[PDB]
Amino acid sequence: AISIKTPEDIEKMRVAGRLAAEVLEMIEPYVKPGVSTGELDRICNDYIVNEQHAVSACLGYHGYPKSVCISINEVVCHGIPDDAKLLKDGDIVNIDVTVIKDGFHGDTSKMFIVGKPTIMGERLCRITQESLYLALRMVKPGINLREIGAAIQKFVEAEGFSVVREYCGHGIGRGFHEEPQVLHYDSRETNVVLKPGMTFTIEPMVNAGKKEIRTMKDGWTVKTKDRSLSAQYEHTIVVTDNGCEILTLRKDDTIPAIISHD
Numbered sequence: 424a425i426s427i428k429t430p431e432d433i434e435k436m437r438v439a440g441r442l443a444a445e446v447l448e449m450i451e452p453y454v455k456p457g458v459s460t461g462e463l464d465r466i467c468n469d470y471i472v473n474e475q476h477a478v479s480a481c482l483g484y485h486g487y488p489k490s491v492c493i494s495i496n497e498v499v500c501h502g503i504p505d506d507a508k509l510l511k512d513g514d515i516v517n518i519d520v521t522v523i524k525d526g527f528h529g530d531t532s533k534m535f536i537v538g539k540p541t542i543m544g545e546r547l548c549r550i551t552q553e554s555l556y557l558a559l560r561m562v563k564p565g566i567n568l569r570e571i572g573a574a575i576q577k578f579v580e581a582e583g584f585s586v587v588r589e590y591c592g593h594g595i596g597r598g599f600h601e602e603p604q605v606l607h608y609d610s611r612e613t614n615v616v617l618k619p620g621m622t623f624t625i626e627p628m629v630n631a632g633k634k635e636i637r638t639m640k641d642g643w644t645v646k647t648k649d650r651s652l653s654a655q656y657e658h659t660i661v662v663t664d665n666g667c668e669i670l671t672l673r674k675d676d677t678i679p680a681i682i683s684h685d
């Protein structure tokens with residue numbers, strides 16, 4: 424149950440992915456102490472609608488109320504932007520964006536450290552991004568997703584961190600969440616061999632403490648059960664003939680857009 428994108432569709436995914444990445448590049452300057460997550464969401468939405476001439480794929484998805492997800496510190500994902508929630512010195516914050524342009528989805532997120540970074544916050548973000556990077560370097564036809572998931576987990580746990588099990592990467596295209604499911608840990612259920620033309624995301628959620636999570640009573644905000652810090656990075660990619668191409672690369676990424684093997 425895997426869809427292979429055509430050359431024309433891949434190009435449309437390049438545009439959509441570029442826009443998603445540019446939302447993150449655009450919002451960066453605004454992520455400072457004192458700003459509310461609510462205003463950040465409005466800034467992102469105005470940019471997506473009025474500048475990119477695109478739309479947020481998150482607003483309305485399964486009932487999601489905002490345009491982007493903004494998760495702070497112990498919040499694992501789906502943090503709901505609120506005008507009463509202000510960023511403060513030392514915070515680590517994930518902004519997850521998904522835009523739809525010309526029928527295709529671009530999905531990506533990154534961590535931002537607010538004000539003076541704490542060594543542990545910086546470490547968690549660094550390791551989480553590196554876990555995404557190592558997985559990306561493994562992508563190529565013939566490899567099984569189980570191997571990639573196993574590699575992410577092994578690396579993350581070697582750092583004394585844990586991998587959230589409830590959420591996974593996913594196929595993406597005209598649909599937000601398409602097959603296959605891309606687990607970030609080793610599961611005996613996973614058996615998917617990559618093929619050229621497949622487009623999916625890798626978005627590991629890593630906790631500094633234990634893997635268990637808790638959903639708040641707003642039905643969206645997810646936090647670590649032990650309230651330890653949590654970080655996430657995500658990229659949308661297309662499998663090429665001998666590797667992959669990152670469709671949501673940013674200027675601050677320290678990995679190449681085109682990853683070729685041999």
Ligand SMILES: NNC(=O)c1ccc(-c2ccccc2Cl)o1
Binds near residue numbers: 490491492600
């Ligand atoms: N930006 N929002 C998202 O990425 C989002 C909101 C809700 C979900 C979701 C994803 C997989 C399964 C169920 C849900 Cl409510 O993702």
Ligand SMILES: [Mn+2]
Binds near residue numbers: 519532626657
């Ligand atoms: Mn996302």
Ligand SMILES: [Mn+2]
Binds near residue numbers: 531592626
């Ligand atoms: Mn995603």
Ligand code: NA
Binds near residue numbers: 516517
């Ligand atoms: Na977090």
